[PDB]
Design a protein around this ligand. Structure first.
Ligand SMILES: Nc1ncnc2c1ncn2[C@@H]1O[C@H](COP(=O)(O)OP(=O)(O)OP(O)(O)=S)[C@@H](O)[C@H]1O
Lengths: 350, 689
């Protein structure tokens, strides 16, 4: 019966079993296995499991004593795929138009319109933008606009944090790049989003191997995978930062990333709307003038406005007052900014 | 106040203290009492006491209804004969009479089988006509015809709440949860109140579930009374089955009243506005003819491509694209290409004869037989293409005109659906009596007489299909016969509402699992779908049968059965291992609009290695979607780049670009793991406009 063939396959196995990372096909079914530490005899494979599920160089089930290949690896549920594979198209495309409106149009006719209608390049012989770095001051809307395109979409969105790739094991992060771009390959036309890759360059750890020789290899696997070969076609990938100093220019160059998009901290003409909308869902003594707050901070982000418009209500509701006094706005803004120093200088144009 | 003054009033047994205390308790009965009625343990002793004792029945049903009881609670109301828009009326009428009369209707509806519950039921019906919130009172008063006089009693003013709300939730829940025999009362009394009402497609969906012949006469004197017009001719002809357009064209052949219903409601006027307007508002380009028509060569993929190009319909260009493409073609693909000029043009009646006429009576048997097949494809109201094929048909064993019998018996099955056409079946008696070794002779015999016979009056066990049962069990050879004859058997079983024909063919038929597979085919086709879960747990047990083809069709019945409550239709058939079962769910998705969960199942079903199952995925995969669409297609290019797989990919490309007419031909497709001779009929699943 099937039971004896299954038991004989199970007794081809020797119950302490192991796992090792490979390199290359050795086409006539005898193989050779690195471990983590790589001790590599000319091993076999237990020929009822499928050798040809897998491309070259990936984890399989091994033995400890004759090292032989036993079974396919488990499709190992790392904590990335549950975050990488975006489950639902969440929310927040535009609750409130009037935050940017400059590069909303740009991200539209550079990310939606090439992708969602891939028939304009038929007329005019133009290549699509593969990577666009959306960047600027911290607290602008980059993560927000990422979620905005993530809901307002017809492509399978993907969302990646840059510290997801940082694990202490050897070759772990490159494998996570491999499974990451397998996720980026095998859904659909897809919109990958990557965030916090300026928090990867001047960065070293203690849960770590040799620092400059660890994520050089991981980001080099990212280099060799992202816009290398394995034909690009139609796979949308967006990377976002705050600063640009720690960026290797080998990835900044064309071929890999085409368009470079800043974001200005907004003018007062839209500060009035952002302060209004952040204050749109509370009770407030309407005699107070936000135009003080609007004119005051000269390089405000929207996290500033967020913390101000919420923390003034927090200072009022701290002593259970529904509506906010203007000196609670004083307390709020002088909590929010460490040393609110925008008066003279200047102050005395005047 | 405190219960100190009012509480010892239950202690005396003098009549005046009761007959003023109970009106005093009636004033406080607007909130029942101060509280949750803890007079109960002291006043339950007052049961044995006997003038205004029906007021004592009001107190007794008030307090027993106030705490809890299932049968003794409505006994003071059925003893009381209720006598003597308010908050108190909402209390003792709404919640107390609704729940109390509800448990009386349930307990006596399951218990006995009086007129008292009928009078109380009409009284509560009137009181909830006063309350005017239907929905819950309606679904309560279903389970006590009662519902008939309930509807004609209720329907005076409000139209769309009862119609839309009641007929929506109770039509959907009646096909969903409720068994069949009360749905006839839905349909007949809904025929009454919708016969009172306008917006006639409610009555036309009553014609969908009823299949009645009086209804179309009433809705044509009434829908001629309401003079769009050809558009209800269109979804009239789409909505109607095989029987009622021939009964409709015979009684309207008598009367017709303007003759424009003889114009519209037989044929040719569902189809005259579309095809020019198909050319007009749509503008389809040429680079899929050339590109999708460029996908290489190999007389198969190329042959399939001819079919793909052919089902393109911006003109009948691929029809008239020169010569030497069909000369490369071979026998059953020459059937497919000779019928493909049928497939490009399912209109142009006058143009059909003058395009097929070159390929009529040609040098090749497959050109002429597939040509008459194309004549059967293009139309269904001509019936003058019969006689050039009809005359030839007889061969007595296996000559040419039996292949014209395949295309012309099948294409004439495409052509007409009479009350019972009998002349073509008297032609079908030397067809099954002929019994060529070619499968599709008896194949299109059963399937074609089934297309004549779908929608029969609760089916029939007549000598036609009885004859093909006995002549079926005559010859046990080439088991495709033992599969496609129970096809047309179960097609004649379609039209059932209550048919015992599964028991009749169960007595006549069952044997060794060829005819037990006939038993499971009649078991599939006789059971279209209702709230009838007993055959779904029968499906659970006999799903585990060791013969693994009655598994195939018996589990394949699911997309027929639960097609409306489709949220349960995701099952763990992929989590099973009997690979044809993964084929069954792969069928069971099918073609409708196909949500993300369905394509998510095509995530795994897209990736499989057996060429009949990897062949089986793009067919329903691109039926369910009639980049995005072409993204799984290029993913299939990533899958292979066998020849079957290439053919499957071509089929998927073709797909990319309870009406029985869409129910038959894919169950005709369910034996695909076979010759291209079988695939010569693969292009006869004509289910799309
Ligand atoms: N609908 C909207 N339109 C425009 N701006 C918005 C909208 N909703 C929110 N915002 C602003 O966008 C900001 C989004 O903040 P984020 O960009 O997530 O800050 P951040 O995450 O610190 O950015 P980093 O530092 O690069 S991770 C919020 O602080 C809001 O003020």
């Amino acid at each position: 019966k099937q039971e004896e063939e299954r038991s004989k396959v199970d007794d081809l196995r020797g119950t302490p079993m192991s796992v090792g990372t490979l390199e290359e096909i050795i086409d006539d079914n005898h193989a050779i296995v690195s471990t983590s530490v790589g001790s590599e005899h000319y091993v076999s494979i237990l020929s009822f499991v499928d050798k040809d599920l897998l491309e070259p160089g990936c984890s399989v089930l091994l033995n400890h004593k004759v090292h032989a290949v036993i079974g396919v690896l488990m499709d190992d549920t790392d904590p990335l795929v549950t975050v990488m594979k975006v489950e639902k198209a969440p929310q927040e495309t535009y609750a409130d138009i009037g935050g940017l409106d400059n590069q909303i149009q740009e991200i539209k006719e550079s990310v939606e319109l090439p992708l969602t209608h891939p028939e304009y390049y038929e007329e005019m012989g133009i290549k699509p933008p593969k990577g666009v770095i959306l960047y600027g001051p911290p607290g602008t809307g980059k993560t927000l606009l990422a979620k905005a395109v993530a809901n307002q979409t017809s492509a399978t969105f993907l969302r990646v944090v840059g510290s997801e790739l940082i694990q202490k094991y050897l070759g772990d992060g490159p494998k996570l790049v491999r499974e990451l771009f397998r996720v980026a390959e095998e859904h659909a036309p897809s919109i990958v989003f990557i965030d916090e890759i300026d928090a990867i360059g001047t960065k070293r750890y203690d849960s770590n191997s040799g620092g400059e020789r660890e994520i050089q290899r991981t980001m080099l696997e990212l280099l060799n995978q992202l816009d290398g070969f394995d034909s690009r076609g139609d796979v949308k990938v967006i990377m976002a930062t705050n600063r640009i100093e720690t960026l290797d220019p080998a990835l900044i160059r064309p071929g890999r990333i085409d368009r470079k998009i800043e974001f200005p901290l907004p003018d007062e003409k839209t500060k009035k709307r952002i302060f209004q909308i952040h204050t749109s869902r509370m009770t407030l003594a309407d005699d107070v003038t936000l135009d003080d707050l609007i004119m005051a901070k000269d390089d405000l982000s929207g996290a500033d406005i967020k913390a101000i418009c919420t923390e003034a209500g927090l200072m009022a509701l701290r002593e259970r007052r529904m509506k906010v006094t203007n000196e609670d706005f004083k307390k709020s803004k002088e909590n929010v900014l460490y040393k609110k120093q925008e008066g003279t200088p200047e102050g005395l144009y005047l | 106040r405190d219960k100190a003054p009012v509480q010892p009033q239950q202690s005396p047994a003098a009549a005046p203290g009761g007959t003023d205390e109970k009106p005093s308790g009636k004033e406080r009965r607007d909130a029942g009492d101060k509280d949750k009625e803890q007079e109960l343990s002291e006043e339950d002793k007052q049961l044995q006491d006997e003038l205004y004792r029906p007021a004592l029945e009001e107190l007794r049903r008030q307090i027993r209804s106030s705490t809890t009881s299932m049968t003794s609670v409505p006994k003071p109301l059925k003893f009381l004969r209720p006598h003597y828009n308010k908050r108190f009326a909402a209390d003792i009428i709404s919640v107390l009479a609704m729940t109390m009369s509800g448990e009386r209707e349930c307990l006596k509806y399951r218990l006995v089988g009086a007129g008292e519950v009928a009078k109380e039921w009409q009284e509560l019906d009137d009181a909830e006509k006063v309350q005017r919130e239907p929905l819950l009172t309606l679904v309560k008063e279903i389970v006590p015809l009662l519902m008939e006089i309930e509807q004609v009693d209720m329907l005076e003013k409000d139209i769309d709440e009862n119609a839309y709300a009641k007929v929506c939730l109770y039509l959907t829940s009646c096909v969903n949860y409720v068994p069949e025999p009360e749905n006839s009362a839905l349909l007949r009394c809904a025929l009454g109140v919708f016969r009172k009402f306008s917006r006639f497609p409610e009555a036309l969906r009553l014609a969908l579930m009823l299949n009645d012949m009086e209804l179309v006469e009433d809705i044509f004197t009434s829908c001629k009374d309401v003079v769009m017009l050809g558009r209800h001719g269109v979804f009239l002809e789409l909505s109607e089955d095989v029987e009622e357009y021939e009964d409709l064209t015979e009684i309207m052949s008598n009367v017709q009243l303007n003759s424009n219903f003889l114009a519209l409601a037989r044929e040719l006027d569902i189809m005259e506005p579309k095809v020019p307007d198909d050319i007009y508002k749509t503008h389809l380009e040429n680079n899929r003819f050339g590109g999708s028509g460029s996908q290489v060569d190999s007389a198969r993929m190329n042959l399939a491509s001819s079919f793909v190009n052919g089902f393109v319909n911006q003109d009948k260009l691929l029809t008239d694209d020169g010569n030497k493409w069909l000369y490369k073609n071979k026998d059953h693909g020459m059937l497919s290409a000779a019928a493909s000029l049928g497939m490009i043009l399912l209109w142009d009646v006058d143009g059909g004869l003058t395009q097929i006429d070159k390929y009529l009576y040609s040098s090749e048997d497959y050109i002429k037989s597939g040509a008459l097949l194309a004549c059967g494809i293009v139309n269904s109201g001509v019936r003058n293409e019969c006689d050039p094929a009809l005359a030839l048909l007889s061969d007595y064993v296996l000559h040419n005109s039996n292949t014209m019998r395949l295309g012309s018996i099948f294409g004439l099955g495409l052509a007409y659906a009479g009350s019972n056409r009998e002349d073509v079946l008297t032609l079908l008696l030397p067809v099954m009596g002929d019994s060529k070794s070619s499968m599709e002779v008896a194949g299109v015999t059963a399937l074609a007489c089934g297309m004549i016979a779908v929608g029969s009056c609760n089916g029939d066990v007549t000598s036609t299909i009885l004859q093909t049962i006995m002549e079926k069990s005559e010859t046990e050879l080439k088991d495709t016969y033992a599969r496609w004859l129970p096809l047309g058997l179960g097609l004649n079983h379609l039209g059932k509402g209550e048919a015992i024909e599964a028991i009749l063919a169960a007595l006549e038929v069952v044997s060794e699992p060829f005819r037990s597979f006939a038993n499971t085919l009649v078991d599939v086709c006789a059971y279209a779908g209702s709230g009838n879960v007993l055959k779904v747990q029968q499906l659970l047990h006999i799903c585990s049968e060791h013969f693994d083809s009655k598994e195939k069709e018996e589990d394949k019945d699911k997309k027929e059965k639960k097609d409306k409550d489709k949220k349960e239709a995701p099952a763990d058939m992929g989590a099973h291992q009997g690979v044809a079962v993964l084929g069954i769910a792969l069928i069971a998705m099918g073609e409708e609009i196909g949500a993300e969960m369905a394509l998510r199942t095509f995530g795994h079903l897209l990736r499989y290695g057996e060429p009949t199952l990897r062949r089986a995925v793009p067919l329903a995969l691109a039926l369910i979607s009639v980049s995005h669409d072409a993204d799984p297609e290029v993913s299939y290019n990533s899958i292979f780049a066998a020849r079957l797989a290439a053919m499957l990919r071509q089929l998927a490309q073709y797909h990319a670009k309870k009406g029985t007419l869409t129910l038959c031909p894919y169950h005709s497709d369910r034996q695909l793991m076979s010759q291209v001779a079988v695939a010569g009929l693969l292009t006869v699943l004509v289910s799309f406009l």
